[model samples]
Target: HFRIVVGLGKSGMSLVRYLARRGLPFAVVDTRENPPELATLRAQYPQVEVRCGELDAEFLCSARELYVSPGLSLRTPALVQAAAKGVRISGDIDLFAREAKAPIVAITGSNAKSTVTTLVGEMAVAADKRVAVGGNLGTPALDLLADDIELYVLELSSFQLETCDRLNAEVATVLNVSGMADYHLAKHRIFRGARQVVVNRADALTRPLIADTVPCWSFGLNKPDFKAFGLIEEDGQKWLAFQFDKLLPVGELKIRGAHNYSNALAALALGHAVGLPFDAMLGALKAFSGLAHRCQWVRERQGVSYYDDSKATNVGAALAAIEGLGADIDGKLVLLAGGDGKGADFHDLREPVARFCRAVVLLGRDAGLIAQALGNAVPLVRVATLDEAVRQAAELAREGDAVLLSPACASLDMFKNFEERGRLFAKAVEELA
Candidate 1:
């Protein structure tokens, strides 16, 4: 009668749990009759009504409010009409924020927020703070709530931030920014209602466009200015530094790549912003081995090392992987790229591929599109499958050359998701002699 939950995914079920605990009256709806959590919902809340198939405008309009799922766009025609008719719309984040007792460290970006959020979480643990980590990365925000929790570190996605009007985070950051449906708008929302901001000095896009008075800290790869975090080179050794005070040596970090170093600086900056000690945060960075499918090292064969970075699901991410890992490797990279391009411009990849890659091995849908964009930049090889792409990459690789599977596209054209694409890439690399 008063509220409705849309799309029965992980976030939706979280919404169900949140609503149920409050004894709120709400109905569930999904275009698909049987969503991933259908059985669980049916068993737990038999009394709750669920409408399957098309979002009924009349039924949606009936509710005073709707907790819409992230997978479902807000521009869904029925939702637009309902909002037009004065029906309030929000996501799980808004609700979580309303009741959260602990200070939130809300983070969003086009890439690296997951690693940054996780690192910050570990830092909290190191500092002996009672912190709950997860939002778009692992756990739903509502589920992480507890009576005794002191800090909340959340990786907010663009989708989640769409309806998050009152994040009011104790510390909020747009780690870096690029790509999206409404690519720029949704990511910038993390700064809204945020008390303290962490901005990437290197990525001007991450700086808040409207916050004139918000207290801010910045991170970058160059030497840090006052109240900023960056790299300091002294006696030919690089150190992570805060305003010229060296905090940690760059070589001590377990995570590789220039991108990862940036991620560490960002994590340290965020942790610092939230009042976590420098010692604990640096300790966490040293222990972090980095996430899988994000420039993860695979087995070496015949003096050539293979790395899987299937998480480079977009052009900017792929470009970052190319430039970051490319700069660190002993020899040029043999790149395994291509998949569903998702209508993104591939022209940005040309310079990096030309500079770093010995050859470009293409696969999946839109391989030709990438090929056209990267013509004559390097040797181009087209293969039908990832397995073939891996083999081709191996053949093209030489001693000390790193073979990278940093596909600048989505995996849905061949595999289920980026994780699966990464898994199979690793598997193919594993089976190689």
Candidate 2:
């Protein structure tokens, strides 16, 4: 029974190494004639067969099993046919889940996953838990598995979750998902036999498909109820609470934005579920400020404040920034948006943009698409580039006004990635400071 890995991206390459380490027989497959990893695969896996180009039914059906790269679509006709034939299709996550030794805290969401994941990791570390934290970030999930580790904190995506099965994590949270069609399908996959399922009270979609016997915990910005983690108004101030247990004051949270406060509540729910003391988790929250390139402060120039939320690579994230900061702005908000849009409907931003923004400055590959979607919602001004967009955003603003770069799309259309987009935005803003 020959095993094949389809695609040669990071996930595929990791699978290759994992199979080799286990001394398992596996071949490689990729759509491109020369994938970037082709050279490495050929050099290191000389004995393994490397098939390049289109996958036909005959070619794929030959394999008894297949390990798919998360970035690769399984919707291809050949792969679809193979799946229909019942060839055991799995990903690195499936393999990791089967072999992992420690209790796992799996985290997934559309936005702020990294923030929550890192915050949870920090919380575990603060209380002296021996933890291995990585999955969809830093190191691959498989690479983090070890017998010695006490806990495993993973930031899994819908990509990894789709192929995952019977994974009974200690606790699980589906934070959010995508314009990617198969998105919701994968997010729900995390709940398959989980010991505890974390629910986002604000978004019912995250209520995972799990057994009635399984315990479910909910978290949100609203007041905590039975089996929930949330905020409660006490003496005219909000405090994060777990049902009747008030954990910490909301003002004590170091991370800015209401979205982050929600993230904090979710993280608290996760960390608390794992037996971490309230004081330890709350201490970690105070120490945690925010993630870079995600609603990060750029600079204040001539009384105008600018924020770099370049990681707002989707409509929901951009909307989160709008709602989170919009209420706190001293004056008008100059909303800088637009990018690949990633097949998202920008019309969803209409209400927030209309209410919060004084002028909307757009740029990137799909700027016109955004302009069309939000025409006359605010003062629509589409520019040719990011630098120009930044300049225009600054010019259209006055003292106390905020210039926010929360593009409701992917950065790949304009730059290499969101990180690059954020760096350039920060640099441009800092230049005028």
Candidate 3:
């Protein structure tokens, strides 16, 4: 009997349902005293077994294969025992890859995966190919896969990639690797576990970080590899070009900043590698709209343009947002930084902030800590709430200035998450307008 043991959670629930529908035997496990969702599933499927409280070695000994959730840590006793017993561990995406017939264009990076993944799907749609876009962007890869999809565009997080052992993308790329934090300690470890997730799956034309034969492509503003993508300023238009082939004219892209330009180039390169026509790819590029919270233009009141980049919770992400805003910033850029200290080094951010920012508005519990680190290098102000931060940022901005909420820290201290913080910033901007 092929029995798959799935941990209980959103993705786990999906796995349970999928396995049950296929008439495959499986058991759901959760430490929660009573996982209501699992209870509901139990009511629906009387044959399925549910285990509560801490998982034990006996549970690991019983299962042939373990389908662990991204949230589950490798340090868990059950998982550790499973590893010792030679029980194979895998994620939903790994299962999808092993089972799905469609070719996948997997994307991973320290930043810009969401934008690139979504944009690539748009490009495929523009090319008239049946495509499904999901993975780590709230929609699990397995959930979005359909029978008609010719291509699957996955925005994979390192956590999702962890349990995946055999994933080979037709075209794969790594945008950049900036820094680390402690907030998602378990997830990051899984990310490290799947270190070869990108390089191990590249083609010959693309550079592979791993010595595997799969072709891999790389794009970055600073680093140049065998196949590199970057921006070329031509006749006042920033065009995305790869090895001299211009795929998309930069002016036509709705997204702003150099980082985004790099993202566009990466998408174009992947599209070209997968045999998409240049014209169709260009059409898709032109037709693509940007993602939310990553340097999204919220509003402009009086002379100040407000950008909601609250998704930038790391120092590197925050730096990308500021750099993307360009250097014409002078004294007009008001950077809103600070939040729950996620063990990220703020020192790396100081130099960049000093280079481009006019002033900064800090929020969350660690605002004082960040201010102390700044050490008066750039002007700093502390606000207790998101609204106060926006108000102070607006006051600091002049005509043609940008008030960007690129918090370089997590929002858990003051808000539920980055999305909530971004929503609050937008709401405050609309109110002030």
Candidate 4:
């Protein structure tokens, strides 16, 4: 009755380790009979009571608390009743919050936070500070705990944020909350009890609820007010600005496109909020090219440049990839998209596709759904597999054009994850004759 962990995935497994480290008694329950980590779970804790296949209502209800994987909805019927019965429902991140000793910089958004998280980590390292980077991005936040970590740059998802009660970050940002379709009620977790908030001035939806005494910083594509970072027009060029102070010309940014340009500015605002030196942060910005599989440039086959944005697993993310990479290209974008739609509407991509892409090659589980939505907007071609989709994209792509693999949907239906999907796309592109 003291403890039980549900959904024995990455987070649940991590909970087991942490609890075992403390010599605490806990049980684990998962809906699947053959959970992926079942062997490891049994091997690590032979004496622990582990049940799989279904939620044991009596067992769960009797527990003092439930530690769940973020992948499970907090609103599931059993979990809902457990909550109604006064059982504690929490995640490993909740455990991490209780133990973290360093200043946290939590970043969450519908898109591009991976790039931003990595950029800020580089900024901290460039300043010669000890930093731990990765939460939802790589390492589970719970596992990153150590006595040596000075700064925690966490890329939190709406999923992780939902079960988390409070994490008093030195700086926190909700990059842009597109909608609940991705994580629904969970994305709001980024801002709940946030001490210092960083907001997007252009997207009002990103603004967090906080008191006036808590302090705030904002960054956007338009001109900024006092206490914000944005742009200013002078000498016929827009400069990246903090209030009236121009930090540098917008064009001085090494990363391409307006969206990425804004991302650089967001990193600056976050880096600066944590009191990192402008020189060090700016230096890192100049050197930080970008992360792979998020607008990452692959080799040019013949004359066409290929980009792998396999991490654009939502509509907003795909929009960012399309607009971010599409703007600078001399030729059109031949977009290869479609995977698990995750119940997202493809209408958002419709207008962007019309404006930027020459055609869209679809594949995977939801290819037909996307094609049905986007067929009227641009040329839509359906292929049975990712490689075929890539091949079709190449056929439509020409010199000065970009062949982009930005699925705008989850990859589990087609591949293991976005990284695998991206790697497969890259290999396919490399092998293209």
By lDDT, the candidates rank as 1, 4, 2, 3
Q: Which residue window of length 10 is worst by lDDT in model 2?
A: 176-185
Off by over 4 Å in 3: 83-86, 177-206, 209-216, 222-228, 235-237, 249-252, 283-289, 299-306, 310-320, 328-433
Candidates sorted on TM-score, descending: 1, 2, 4, 3
TM-score of 3: 0.71
Residue pairs in clash, model 2: 108-175, 109-175, 109-176, 110-176
Q: Quote the lDDT for 7 in model 2.
A: 82
Question: Candidate 3: lDDT of 131?
Answer: 87
Residue 296 lDDT (model 4)? 75
Error of 4 at 278 (Å): 1.3
Candidate 4 lDDT tens digits, 352-390: 899999998988898989988886758889898777888
For residues 1-433, what per-residue lDDT tens digits would candidate 2 score against the true structure? Answer: 7788888877788888889998988888788987898888778889989889888767777889888878777677888899889788888889888898778898887757888899999999999989999887468877776778999998888778877876778898888542565778777777766788778888887886673577888888888889889888899667888998787877565455667888888888888888888889989998874787777776778887788888899998899888887886658789998888778888899888888899999887888888888876478888987888889998899997889889878888769989999899988887773
lDDT of 1: 0.86
Q: What are the C-alpha RMSDs, in order, of all predicted structures? A: 5.4, 5.6, 6.2, 6.1
lDDT of each: 0.86, 0.83, 0.72, 0.83
Best by TM-score: 1
| Model 1 spans > 4 angstroms off | 178-181, 209-211, 297-322, 329-433
